[PDB]
Amino acid sequence: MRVLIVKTSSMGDVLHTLPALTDAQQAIPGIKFDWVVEEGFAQIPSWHAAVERVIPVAIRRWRKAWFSAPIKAERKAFREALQAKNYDAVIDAQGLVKSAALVTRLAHGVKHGMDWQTAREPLASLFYNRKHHIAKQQHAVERTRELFAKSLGYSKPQTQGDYAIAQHFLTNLPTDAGEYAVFLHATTRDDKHWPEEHWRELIGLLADSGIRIKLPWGAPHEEERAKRLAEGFAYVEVLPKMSLEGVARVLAGAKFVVSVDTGLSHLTAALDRPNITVYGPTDPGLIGGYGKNQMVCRAPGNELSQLTANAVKQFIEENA
Ligand SMILES: Nc1ncnc2c1ncn2[C@@H]1O[C@H](COP(=O)(O)OP(=O)(O)O)[C@@H](O)[C@H]1O
Secondary structure (H helix, E strand, O other): OEEEEEOOOOHHHHHOOHHHHHHHHHHOOOOEEEEEEEHHHOHHHHOOOOEEEEEEEOHHHHHOOOOOHHHHHHHHHHHHHHOOOEOOEEEEOOOOHHHHHHOHHHOEOOEEEEOOOOOOOHHHHHHOOEEEOOOOOOOHHHHHHHHHHHHHOOOOOOOOOOOOOOHHHHOOOOOOOOOEEEEEOOOOOHHHOOOHHHHHHHHHHOOOOOOEEEEOOOOHHHHHHHHHHHOOOOOEEEOOOOOHHHHHHHHHOOOOEEEEOOHHHHHHHHOOOOEEEEEOOOOHHHHOOOOOOEEEEEOHHHOHHHOOHHHHHHHHHHOO
16 A cells, blocks of 8 residues: 655644554555655655655745746656656645645545545645545644544554654664753744743753753854854854754754744654743644643743743753
8 A cells, every 4th residue: 555645834734744654554554655745844754664755846936936947847857756656545634725736636546635624725625535524623643643544444543643753863863862952942933932031041040950952053043043042151052054854863862852833843742852842922732742741831921031941941840
């Protein structure tokens, strides 16, 4: 059995899909998955043992000059890669018209997806051969598990979902694994950031613990912030620029993590690492992490400026 997955975007959404592949592999031995995913996250599916082919798309980038010869080429190579194999099942775990019309529609095989009532965009259901009813009021990880389960003919296990990507890194963990913690300070919205002042205070509180802290960064401004947070603390290091798989390895070796509501926080949960995610304008109950050792820390009045470094540590301490 070879199945095709359409779940391209939002690092988090991609990551939350992993537990479903694990259920499938355990219930259907020998099952392999191909995965159509946004180029920026293409490495994530390769970490799962049940994944074979990873087929990258770049919808947003392609949308800006859709008929240019350069893109036309990429798009042609994409469609050919997508239509190369004939699948026993195509599972659209995205439920958006855009990817359903551009990806799902073109795949060879019975197409499964969420029905009119439960798809993110109802009209997306019209593009599937099998429309499944997946209840909206449950975690995204569970919903996708239910989807894979109903699509492949097996009952969803009652055990907690297992991302099963950690194993990919445990074979080659950083030498200093467990000697440090990782602080994920970078995200996309101003109000989702925990004020720098507070990050430093938290860093400061750990000065005499003996722990080391590593700060990742994706873009120049983030590195600058990273340099400002480490300024003065010898036990704090600013990581070099690296790929997702690179920062994945570092996370895998972190004893624990403190982070803002962002994709890398979801990755950290996928690697089963203790993590304290701090929320402000976004709600964890709706968009929170999945994974057991995932600890939610709400800011007073949902305003991170009101979250003290003291409370975050007084949190890490009482969530040990
Ligand atoms: N390889 C990387 N190393 C460090 N940070 C990264 C890397 N890739 C993405 N990011 C961070 O993820 C964020 C952008 O996307 P995402 O994580 O999904 O965030 P959000 O959920 O806030 O939209 C940025 O803050 C970006 O720097």
